[PDB]
């Protein structure tokens, strides 16, 4: 296999926004390790002239999720949202950064 181009580690929320604001297409995203919740992950996505942030939650069994559907890994959560919108307000499909 090859590594994933979307894991940025501990990049500040502000820097994620600065980086994603420069992206060409809506849906461009990255997964970052939260600085507010040690051990927690956040999903940053470009949409128009904004950058939306989604908190990656974990249920009682340790599965990850954003809304209702649960995933056994960040990898599956990410791939799922390439075909299903991450947003409740508009259609936003995840696309790898350029």
């Amino acid at each position: 296999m090859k590594p994933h181009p979307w894991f940025f580690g501990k990049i500040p929320r502000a820097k994620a926004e600065e980086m994603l604001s420069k992206q060409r297409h809506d849906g461009a995203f990255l997964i970052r390790e939260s600085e507010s919740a040690p051990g927690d992950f956040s999903l940053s996505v470009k949409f128009g002239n904004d950058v939306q942030h989604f908190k990656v939650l974990r249920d009682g069994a340790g599965k990850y999720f954003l809304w209702v559907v649960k995933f056994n890994s960040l990898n599956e959560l990410v791939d799922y949202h390439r075909s299903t919108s991450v947003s409740r307000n508009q259609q936003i499909f995840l696309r790898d950064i350029e």
């Binding site: 942030h53 939650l57 307000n89």
Partner: peptide, 7 residues
């Protein structure tokens, strides 16, 4: 904050 309610 985040787009998805966190609690």
């Amino acid at each position: 904050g985040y787009e998805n309610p966190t609690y």
